[PDB]
């Protein structure tokens, strides 16, 4: 039950996920990134049970890179969102149902618009400027679209996410132990590891 967040501004999208390795009595490492690095214009974040989430490694991206190797082209995140969820939905009626909460981000170069998606373990695909899973949506959704504006830039979106972190550092008993900032724009993925020291 980690705390995952994210926001899609006008020209780009920003994702922030908690960094912790914790099962139940203890915190192992202060930095844990649940995600994979896709093509520079596409990004995806992971949340859920730590057991099956880390098991991902290369599964979907192996087929995504297979197209990126063959045609040297990057598909839009909207088409990928209809794939990852398509495979996870078939697992419900299989022998071992999987529970994972995924956030599919990235940037579409065809229409020159950013895309961010929120998919739970029930296979629910949605296009939202924001996203959350579990208890991470209770202290956010009230403060997300309330102060959100379509013309908001990147600088105003960095402190907007930190504004919700202040509620997570008090109202939320669990500690996120740092996060990671990755913005996806027309240029590509820009990894910013400075949050508490920002």
């Amino acid at each position: 039950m980690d705390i995952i967040l994210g926001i899609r501004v006008q020209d780009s999208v920003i994702l922030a996920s908690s960094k912790a390795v914790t099962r139940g009595i203890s915190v192992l490492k202060d930095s844990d990134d649940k995600t994979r690095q896709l093509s520079p214009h596409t990004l995806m974040s992971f949340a859920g049970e730590a057991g099956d989430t880390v098991q991902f490694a290369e599964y979907i991206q192996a087929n995504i890179q297979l197209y990126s190797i063959r045609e040297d082209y990057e598909l839009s995140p909207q088409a990928v969102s209809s794939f990852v969820r398509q495979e996870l939905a078939k697992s419900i009626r299989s022998r071992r149902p999987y529970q994972v909460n995924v956030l599919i981000g990235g940037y579409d170069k065809k229409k020159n618009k950013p895309e961010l998606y929120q998919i739970d373990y029930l296979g629910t695909k949605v296009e939202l400027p924001y996203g959350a899973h579990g208890y991470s949506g209770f202290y956010t959704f009230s403060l997300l679209d309330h102060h959100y504006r379509p013309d908001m830039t990147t600088e105003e979106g960095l402190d907007l996410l930190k504004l919700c972190v202040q509620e997570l550092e008090k109202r939320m008993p669990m500690d996120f132990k740092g996060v990671i900032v990755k913005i996806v724009d027309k240029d590509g993925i820009r990894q910013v590891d400075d949050f508490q020291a920002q």
């Binding site: 045609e71 082209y73 598909l75 088409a79 990928v80 209809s82 794939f83 398509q86 065809k110």
Partner: protein
């Protein structure tokens, strides 16, 4: 016996090539002539028919020329029954793409996938592949119009103007020197009708022996339109193009 009468035509023959390659081109020569043309406003696809009689009824009119996707057509040269197996089969593989990325499929995916179906018969299983040559015509948001042509040997070669069937080298010669980078719908049809007249032994050209289905860009809107022309409309094409017979 079983081992004595089995010559294994699938494995390597001492021609440097396979038994089933050269002889498959002969059946293509007996097949109707299908000349694909990719124009600026669309893709022109015209094919012939086998033994057009007086009481032969033309309603569906699609025999050697079909349409898979609404934006992507297909043309086959060879035995019709052998082609019909891989017509709906390519659609099943196409509908699986719709289930996958929920969008339009580029032609290049189904080109190599269907090429291994016939090639897999020679590779293993001891079966006989199909001697039917495939011609693919589709649209893309990157390269625009796409026109491809396959062969029973398992390869594929892209062509803007392609000709199969009888007089393959003769039909491609007339369209090679008459080719132009800018061709509209009416420009590419007049060049195809004059070529098909010399391919067969019939007198000039008739609408009953002409199987023609093409694609344009939009009808009421500006994108995504294709329609198979009825044989009644084919007769009106001869009047519009100014060529009666």
């Amino acid at each position: 016996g079983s081992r004595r009468y089995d010559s294994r035509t699938t494995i390597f023959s001492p021609e440097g090539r396979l038994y089933q390659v050269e002889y498959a081109l002969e059946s293509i020569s007996h097949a109707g002539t299908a000349i694909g043309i990719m124009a600026s406003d669309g893709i022109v696809l015209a094919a012939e028919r086998k033994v057009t009689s007086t009481l032969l009824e033309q309603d569906t009119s699609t025999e050697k020329l079909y349409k898979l996707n609404d934006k992507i057509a297909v043309a086959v040269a060879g035995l019709t029954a052998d082609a019909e197996i891989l017509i709906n089969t390519a659609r099943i593989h196409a509908q699986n793409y719709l289930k996958t990325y929920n969008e339009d499929i580029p032609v290049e995916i189904l080109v190599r996938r269907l090429s291994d179906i016939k090639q897999g018969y020679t590779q293993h299983g001891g079966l006989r592949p199909f001697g039917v040559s495939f011609i693919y015509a589709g649209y893309d948001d990157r390269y625009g119009y796409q026109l491809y042509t396959s062969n029973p040997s398992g390869n594929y070669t892209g062509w803007k103007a392609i000709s199969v069937g009888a007089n393959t080298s003769a039909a491609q010669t007339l369209l090679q020197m008459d080719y132009k980078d800018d061709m509209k719908v009416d420009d590419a049809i007049e060049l195809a009708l004059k070529t098909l007249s010399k391919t067969t032994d019939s007198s000039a050209l008739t609408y009953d022996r002409l199987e023609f289905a093409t694609i344009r860009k939009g009808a009421n809107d500006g994108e995504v339109y294709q329609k198979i022309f009825k044989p009644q409309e084919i007769k009106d094409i001869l009047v519009k193009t100014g060529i009666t017979k």
